């Protein structure tokens, strides 16, 4: 991923916030030049993404993890809200379309986790935390977890590099920016909310 | 991606529909053993993903495309609607959470494209077609495209292999499926539409 200056994060807290808010990630490995990717829930351990640890799990039946065992470098992509920006919204000429989006790419060494149960239970807690009410597993569900555990492979990623993109129309003029934000306000409110949060302190001439 | 048989596409048209509906894709290649990925609009030429050709572009300033000069294998991930399934909506015990989603993974040999203006103009037409009204580039805008061409790199992927996941609760019993479909109707209607379209076929 190439982070254009105009779309860089202002603060590392932005990268961590996006990761926590969007835990259904893409786990990617490379084997003899061929990328293979699994969609999996991945959670963040620590205050920052770089130097932090990611925890996730996939199916034991998914052969992807058998390339982890040598501890190669993996990439985990976290994706936030996104949306196509039509030049119709700009109401200007000349114009060029854009796609607004935010993502965090975490690269590091993967290893198999010893405590798969801890990983899936910590995943439950994190994914339910923002909900009301938060589902807490019952003894019977916990018994079911332990019975399902043979089918799980859990893994850790020690993040060596974090790259973050916040392509959120910050390079438009104020009038065009307002038009884009209003257009996303209907039917993509998650992206308009991200636009608002991201503008607060923005890097700029920095 | 490992596609559990219960979550396989019913038809190949199902995969091609997802790719066409979700052109903002993830382009992945390997560089010294590390996966490197770029978010880019990618369109499909052909009726089917497997054996079709994907076309996309990225910045020349993004060093990722230099890995394409040797025509390695590239993975393009198309992502559809998706959503967390909380056991709260299941209203059962014991329960385990899930994440419902649909995605197409297309892998094949990449080739840098000389016809970069062709690729970006075909991308405009494809991404504007579902809009009413659609934006047609004016002469001024097409001149601006030409002015921008030195800074863009276009590429083609000839898809060798396609894997498609449609994990949309269709393995649930009628009662629990209805609660999941009802839950997504509110605040994830794109997923709700995708569950409807997935049922029966297509
Ligand atoms: C907290 C929310 C959770 C989500 C969103 C989630 C999601 C997923 C996903 C997407 C996969 C497929 C990975 C792949 O394609 O290889 C998977 C596999 C699996 N996970 Fe979870 N999981 C969660 C919690 C749990 C818990 C608590 C357990 C209890 C042990 C568990 C056990 C499993 C098992 C057994 C599989 C393999 C299933 C199979 O082979 O069909 N998961 N999970
Ligand atoms: C059709 C809708 C379009 C979308 C959704 C779109 C999206 C994008 C994206 C996401 C990137 C960044 C790629 C990266 O990370 O490397 C990009 C780069 C770029 N695209 Fe497009 N694009 C569109 C049309 C066009 C057109 C018509 C042109 C005309 C030549 C063009 C020229 C460029 C250029 C020059 C860059 C590099 C920008 C820079 O270095 O700052 N794009 N585009
Ligand atoms: N350099 C172009 C980038 C937009 C093309 N892809 O969205 C601009 O002037 O905004």
């Amino acid at each position: 991923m190439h982070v254009f200056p105009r779309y860089a994060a202002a603060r590392p807290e932005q990268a961590a916030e996006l990761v926590r808010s969007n835990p259904f990630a893409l786990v990617v490995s490379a084997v003899d030049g061929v990328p293979v990717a699994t969609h999996a829930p991945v959670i963040l351990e620590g205050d920052a993404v770089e130097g932090g640890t990611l925890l996730g799990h996939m199916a034991r039946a998914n052969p992807h993890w058998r390339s982890f065992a040598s501890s190669p470098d993996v990439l985990v992509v976290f994706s936030g809200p996104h949306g196509y920006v039509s030049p119709t919204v700009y109401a200007t000429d000349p114009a060029v379309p854009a796609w607004d989006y935010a993502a965090v790419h975490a690269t590091g060494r993967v290893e198999l986790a010893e405590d798969a149960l801890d990983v899936v239970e910590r995943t439950v807690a994190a994914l339910e935390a923002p909900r009301d009410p938060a589902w807490t597993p019952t003894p019977a569900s916990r018994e079911r977890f332990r019975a399902l555990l043979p089918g799980v492979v859990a893994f850790r990623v020690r993040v060596r590099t974090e790259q973050s993109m916040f392509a959120l129309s910050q390079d438009l003029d104020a009038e065009r920016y307002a038009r884009v934000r209003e257009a996303f306000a209907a039917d993509n409110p998650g992206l308009a909310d991200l636009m608002d949060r991201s503008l607060e302190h923005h890097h700029h001439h920095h």
Side-chain angles (χ1 to χ4, degrees), chain A residues 3 8 15 21 23 38 41 59 84 92 97 118 130 138 152 154 185:
Chain A
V3 175
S21 297
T38 297
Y84 176 61
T92 191
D118 182 67
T138 77
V152 159

Side-chain angles (χ1 to χ4, degrees), chain A residues 24 38-41 57-59 61-62 120 123-124 127 145 148-149 151-152:
Chain A
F24 190 52
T38 297
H39 303 243
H57 79 280
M58 54 185 57
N62 181 348
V120 296
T123 299
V124 166
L127 270 52
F145 296 173
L148 295 178
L149 213 53
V152 159

Side-chain angles (χ1 to χ4, degrees), chain A residues 58-108 110-113 115-155 157 159-181 183-186 188-195:
Chain A
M58 54 185 57
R60 185 171 294 276
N62 181 348
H64 187 179
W65 64 269
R66 286 189 181 275
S67 66
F68 294 172
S70 11
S71 283
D73 308 85
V74 294
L75 160 71
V76 188
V77 178
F78 298 86
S79 302
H82 68 93
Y84 176 61
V85 178
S86 172
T88 299
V89 172
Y90 297 154
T92 191
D93 197 51
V96 189
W99 207 293
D100 280 25
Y101 78 103
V104 171
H105 289 203
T107 306
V110 69
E111 43 178 74
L112 301 166
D115 206 334
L117 191 58
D118 182 67
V119 169
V120 296
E121 289 191 339
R122 284 162 73 171
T123 299
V124 166
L127 270 52
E128 286 290 333
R131 301 179 60 94
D132 206 358
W135 180 79
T136 36
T138 77
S141 294
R142 288 209 196 278
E143 191 191 7
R144 179 65 82 61
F145 296 173
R146 301 193 290 278
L148 295 178
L149 213 53
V152 159
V153 172
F155 51 93
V157 180
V159 182
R160 187 185 47 261
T161 65
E162 163 261 314
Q163 284 155 311
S164 296
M165 182 86 95
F166 291 89
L168 302 167
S169 296
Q170 313 94 298
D171 53 330
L172 274 37
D173 109 289
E175 202 218 89
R176 254 58 60 169
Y177 179 89
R179 305 193 64 100
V180 173
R181 158 68 163 80
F184 285 138
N188 205 337
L191 182 54
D193 288 340
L194 184 49
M195 284 186 71

